[PDB]
Amino acid sequence: GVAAIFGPSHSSSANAVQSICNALGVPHIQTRWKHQVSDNKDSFYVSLYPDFSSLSRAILDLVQFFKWKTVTVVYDDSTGLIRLQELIKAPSRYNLRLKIRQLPADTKDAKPLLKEMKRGKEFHVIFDCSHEMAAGILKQALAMGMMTEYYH
Amino acid sequence: THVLRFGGIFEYVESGPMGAEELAFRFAVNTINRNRTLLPNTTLTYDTQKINLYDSFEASKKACDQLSLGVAAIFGPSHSSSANAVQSICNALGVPHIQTRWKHQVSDNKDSFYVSLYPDFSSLSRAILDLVQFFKWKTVTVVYDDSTGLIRLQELIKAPSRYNLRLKIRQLPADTKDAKPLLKEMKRGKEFHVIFDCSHEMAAGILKQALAMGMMTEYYHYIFTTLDLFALDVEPYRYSGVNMTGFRILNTENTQVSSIIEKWSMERLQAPPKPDSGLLDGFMTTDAALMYDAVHVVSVAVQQFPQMTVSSLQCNRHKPWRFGTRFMSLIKEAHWEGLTGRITFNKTNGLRTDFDLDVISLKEEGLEKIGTWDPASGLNMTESQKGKPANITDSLSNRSLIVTTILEEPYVLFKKSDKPLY
Amino acid sequence: QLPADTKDAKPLLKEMKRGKEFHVIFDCSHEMAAGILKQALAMGMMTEYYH
Amino acid sequence: TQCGIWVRTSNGGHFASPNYPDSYPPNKECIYILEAAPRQRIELTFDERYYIEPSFECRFDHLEVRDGPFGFSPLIDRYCGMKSPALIRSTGRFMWIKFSSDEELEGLGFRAKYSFIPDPDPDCQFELSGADGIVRSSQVEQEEKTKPGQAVDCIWTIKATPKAKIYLRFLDYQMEHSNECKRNFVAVYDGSSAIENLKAKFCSTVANDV
Ligand SMILES: *[C@@H]1O[C@H](CO)[C@@H](O[C@@H]2O[C@H](CO)[C@@H](O[C@@H]3O[C@H](CO[C@H]4O[C@H](CO)[C@@H](O)[C@H](O)[C@@H]4O)[C@@H](O)[C@H](O[C@H]4O[C@H](CO)[C@@H](O)[C@H](O)[C@@H]4O)[C@@H]3O)[C@H](O)[C@H]2NC(C)=O)[C@H](O)[C@H]1NC(C)=O
Ligand SMILES: *[C@@H]1O[C@H](CO)[C@@H](O[C@@H]2O[C@H](CO)[C@@H](O)[C@H](O)[C@H]2NC(C)=O)[C@H](O)[C@H]1NC(C)=O
Ligand SMILES: *[C@@H]1O[C@H](CO)[C@@H](O)[C@H](O)[C@H]1NC(C)=O
Ligand SMILES: *[C@@H]1O[C@H](CO)[C@@H](O)[C@H](O)[C@H]1NC(C)=O
Ligand SMILES: *[C@@H]1O[C@H](CO)[C@@H](O)[C@H](O)[C@H]1NC(C)=O
Ligand SMILES: *[C@@H]1O[C@H](CO)[C@@H](O)[C@H](O)[C@H]1NC(C)=O
């Protein structure tokens, strides 16, 4: 006997609870992003995480305020292209130079990746990480020369 | 042995006939029962059910209704939302989960009891990337329909970071197949080299609107990610001078394969005709060819294992099935020559990453095989430039004009230098 | 000249593509003028270059 | 030159990375002249500990074998990565190991040793020193280490006086096939037989002074 389900907050597990909450009538409160398929007829759910059909406009506004003509979007897992899809689609309408890269596998070694970025003269980088992963990148961008006055 | 029962979870078509994957599941059980030489003293029985393809709660009930009644394998709800819900049931009970449709495996699942007979897009995105370098392209215009198609092609979006390309990713409208505002902006951008990541029901719908606009010409190339490209009505587009390159895993140059497809359309007497669909006939599409191969690869595994008694596992009191860990090791180590060619599964994953594709392309006689992709080999696109009609223009122009010229100062002498010259 | 009745004029329209013949005048009735454009569309001849 | 246990034996002086196996430092060159000690060669039998900055095409830190002297010598492949290489017989008696190094590395290095005994089925030595000395093409037919019309590998050896530097100037220079650096040339190696110290290589009409 409950009145609300507050979510397992993971993509494979929230979809399992969402269809139970729809069939039984109880509301499912989701607190983390989870890509629903475009034709899921689910109605008994709310989501309090900021949608990436809005957060990917705020990143795209911020690269137009800074007058960039080249970005280097770096994500970690394959779902991160959905979290930023209004930023990948951006050179189709504007004059950006989206060069999409990816972090390595289960290891936490960005030593091969960040070296190829400074050889490509990639000084404007968008990191699609968690704050635990961004702590490891910033330490590995200090051990290299990735921390001058003209990286952003 | 005896009955051994297979499970099934398929489309609930409320008005029309049974689904195309559900016929091909019943057609494959009847083929193995009649043709005795596969499973001689062993017969098969099916326990198919109906879901709404999106309610994961319904696919979870119809799985435990088959697990309680007792099956040997679940043959896939064939949708990303509901296959993930049945995959985790089959892991916690022991029974395998065979699935004939692409699905985003989240990179941190610890699921072991599944095989996927659909050609995996980590291998396919190399196959398109071999084509867009074989035609010596510099700009592409990858067009998808739903947001998961960036996962299907992520080895192609990550191409300009290493190669020399220029991705200009676009998206089709929501369902709403009038994509003429999309195609109008592709004309202004001079975007002649296009990759469509959409199904053949939508790939036959964009070409009606690439023909209603001036985009089916000799300048436009089109690569399609779908494997059902042969099942398009291509009669309006055969004379346009277009190019329509694609793949085909369905092994339609074999006598054994083509005879089953002729026996398939005989069993498709319940075919709804659609003149406005832009599709040829009730061909065996590659989503229904893989369900025919799904039954046979498991039938290899029951042939090598005559100890298999179906139990009656619950879900509220879940126990690993007694023969689940061994029978799953036979499916991942089974080879078969099905209608899609060679079926072999990757031991790390359970994903078909080793498979034979046929590069078909559009010429003025219809779709014709012009090559062959293979993961170990690459493109074997032969094409030879021999078998073509006449009237090519060649200029001899031997403007070398060999001059005989001795050295004799001041007239001819070697240039004084330290570097070598030639 | 168009073929005799035989409204499949694709061998005529194919030779007009090789010649780069983008400016065309049809002296035919509208029953035949609606029949050539089905075959100027089945070939790549209803584009922005052709008048 | 900070490369370590390179000191050779009867064959195969074990030819490891600089400061093996601690870490090799930033930018280095060490050329590792595989002598391929006479009647034998060296087969590069790489040890298990092998990791040098894996990248695309090994445009970064890498390793070479280069069967032949230098340059035009056919490479087997580049050797960067975490797996230990194999398949070396190296039938040439004159070899080389290029180990380049970037500025921002990891990956301690490599080590390999001899495995080639058998035999394949010139000694123009010119030891001299002093304030000057005129090495000519006249002696190469007069010292009787050559034959008219055969492939020579005759190398002049220049030793300085102690605390001195060397300045080769050309008093005469004449090639019978000008601008053809395949069949006749004069190269100037500054030290041992290494492309690390190769100031100039002349096969044209005029040879500048190094
Ligand atoms: C399924 O099982 C396969 C093997 O059974 C596992 O391997 C993946 O699949 C292929 C097989 O090699 C890989 O893709 C190919 O990689 C080749 C090079 O691989 C090395 O690359 C660098 C070398 O420096 C290393 O860092 C790396 O670790 C590998 O050792 C490429 O050469 C291929 O490109 C093209 O090259 C040939 C050259 O002739 C062409 O002919 C072909 O067209 C070919 O396309 C290609 O990129 C793949 O990378 C392997 N790994 C992964 C993670 O996918 C899989 O791991 C396993 N699982 C899955 C999900 O596939
Ligand atoms: C791309 O389309 C062109 C037509 O625009 C094809 O070229 C024609 O087909 C054969 C090749 O087998 C030639 O004999 C014809 O002469 C070609 N036509 C012209 C006008 O040159 C070409 O084969 C297609 N290529 C692919 C890969 O689909
Ligand atoms: C059954 O399949 C086998 C395949 O080996 C072959 O003999 C034939 O296709 C079938 N035989 C009969 C009698 O149906
Ligand atoms: C048929 O049944 C017999 C028992 O009578 C059994 O030994 C055999 O394995 C079965 N299968 C065959 C012959 O393929
Ligand atoms: C490609 O196909 C031809 C036959 O068309 C075959 O002879 C050849 O071995 C295949 N492979 C390669 C790498 O050429
Ligand atoms: C070089 O100079 C020393 C004295 O400085 C002299 O003894 C010697 O003979 C000279 N060298 C030669 C080759 O004459």
> CB D204 to CB B162 under 8 A?
no
DSSP B415: P
Whole-number Å distance between alpha carbons of B81 and B91? 17
Cβ neighbour number for residue D182 with a 10 Å cutoff: 9
Residues near B202 by beta carbon (within 8 Å), at least 6 away in sequence: B145, B172, B177
B310: CB partners within 8 A, 6+ apart: B3, B4, B5, B70, B71, B72
Ligand lying closest to the C-alpha of residue D162:
6
How many other CB atoms are there within 10 angstroms of residue B45's CB atom?
14
SS3 B368: strand
- D chain contacts of residue B416, beta-carbon cutoff 8 Å: 205-206
The three-class DSSP label of residue A111 is: helix
- Whole-number Å distance between alpha carbons of D99 and D84: 15
Chain C residue with CA closest to B235: the answer is C42
Q: Does C41 touch chain B (CB under 8 A)?
A: yes
The DSSP string of D88-124 is: -----SS--------SS-------EE--B--------
Question: Which of D56, D179, D208 faces B420 most closely, judged by CB atoms?
Answer: D179
Cβ–Cβ under 8 Å, residues D117 and D40: yes
From the CB of B41, is ligand 4 less than 6 Å away? yes
Residue B255 Cβ inside 6 Å of ligand 3? The answer reads no
**d(CA B161, nearest CA chain D) in Å:** 11
Residue B317 tokens read as 């009191």
Measured CA to CA, the distance from residue B155 to residue B165 in angstroms comes to 13
Our CA-based measurement puts residue B106 at a distance from the nearest CA of chain A, in whole angstroms, of: 8
- CA D64 from chain centre, in angstroms, equals 12
The dihedral of CA B280, B285, B288, B292: what is its sign?
A: positive
Contacts of B21 (CB under 8 A, 6+ apart): B10, B11, B78, B100, B287, B288, B291
Q: Do B217 and C44 touch (CB under 8 A)?
A: yes
Within 10 angstroms of residue D175's Cβ, the number of other Cβ atoms is 18
Please name the residues in contact with B379: beta carbons below 8 A apart, sequence gap of 6 or more: B130, B131, B134, B359, B371, B372, B373
Whether residue B80 contacts residue B55, with contact meaning beta carbons closer than 8 Å, is answered with no
Q: What is the DSSP string of D1-46?
A: ----TT---SS------TTTTT---SS----------TT-B---EE
Which residue type occupies B260? I
Distance between CA A46 and CA A48 in Å, rounded? 7
Give the type of residue at B66.
Answer: Q
**Do D94 and D120 meet the contact criterion of CB atoms below 8 Å apart?**
no
Query: What is the H or E stretch that residue A59 is in?
Result: helix A55-65
User: Please, how many CA atoms are within 13 Å of residue D102, restricted to the half-sphere of its CB?
Assistant: 20
Q: Give CA–CA dist D90/D40, Å, rounded.
A: 10
D19 Cα–ligand 6 center, Å: 42
Kindly identify the ligand whose nearest atom is closest to the C-alpha of B366: 2
Cβ-defined contact of B168 to A92 (cutoff 8 Å): yes
Is the previous residue joined to B410 through a cis bond, with omega within 30 degrees of 0? yes
Spatial separation of the C-alpha atoms in residues B25 and B81, rounded to whole Å: 21
> Within an 8 Å CB–CB cutoff, is residue D115 touching chain A?
no
* 3-state SS class at D81: coil
Report phi then psi at D95, rounded to 5. Answer: -135, -175
Burial of B4 (0-12, 13-18, 19+ CB in 10 A): buried
CA of B380 to the centre of ligand 5 (A): 6
Question: From which experimental method does this structure derive?
Answer: cryo-EM
Residue D21 preceded by cis peptide, ω within 30: yes
Number of C-alpha atoms within 13 angstroms, CB side, residue B170? 23
The answer to whether D56 faces chain B, any CB pair under 8 Å, is yes
Residue type, A145: G
Contacts of B420 in chain D (CB under 8 A): 179-181, 203-204
Which two tokens mark B54?
A: 């999106």
Closest CA of chain D from A88, distance in Å? 24
> Which of B81, B170, B174 comes nearest A40 by C-beta?
B81
Q: Cβ–Cβ of B85/A40 closer than 8 Å?
A: no
Contact B340, B108 (CB under 8 A): no
Residues D176 and D184: beta-carbon distance below 8 Å: yes
What resolution in angstrom units was achieved for this structure?
3.2
Measure the CA–CA gap between B404 and D33, rounded to whole angstroms: 46
All residues at 6 or more sequence positions from B75 whose CB lies less than 8 Å from its CB, including other chains? B6, B7, B8, B9, B25, B98, B99, B100, B291, B294, B295
Tokens 């099905």 belong to which residue? B338
Of the candidates A22, B198, B190, D42, the one whose C-alpha atom is nearest the C-alpha of residue C48 is B190
- Looking at residue D188, the DSSP 8-state letter turns out to be E
Contacts of C44 (CB under 8 A, 6+ apart): B216, B217, B218, B239, B240, B241, B242, C17
Domain positions in chain B are 1-119+249-270+284-354, 120-248+271-283+355-383
Of D88, D71, D69, D70, which is closest to residue D79 (Cα–Cα)?
Answer: D88
Beta bridge partners of residue B337, listed in sequence order: B342
Assess contact for D17 and D108: CB atoms under 8 A. yes
Question: CB of D54 within 8 A of CB of D79?
Answer: no
Q: How far is D205 from chain B (nearest CA, A)?
A: 6
Query: In this structure, which amino acid lies at residue B46?
Result: Y
Amino acid letter for position B38? L
Extract long-range pairs of A106-114: CB within 8 Å, 24+ residues apart.
A108/A133, A108/A136, A109/A140, A110/A136, A110/A137, A110/A140, A110/A141, A111/A140, A111/A144, A111/D106, A112/D53, A112/D54, A112/D55, A113/A74, A114/A140, A114/A141, A114/A144, A114/A146
Look up tokens 């490369």; give the residue.
D3
Q: List Cβ neighbours of B99 (8 Å cut-off, separation of 6 or more).
A: B75, B76, B78, B83, B87, B114, B115, B116, B117, B118
Nearest CA in chain D to B413: D205
* Nearest Cα to Cα of residue D36 among D158, D119, D109, D98: D119
Q: Is B34 exposed, middle or buried (0-12, 13-18, 19+ CB in 10 A)?
A: exposed
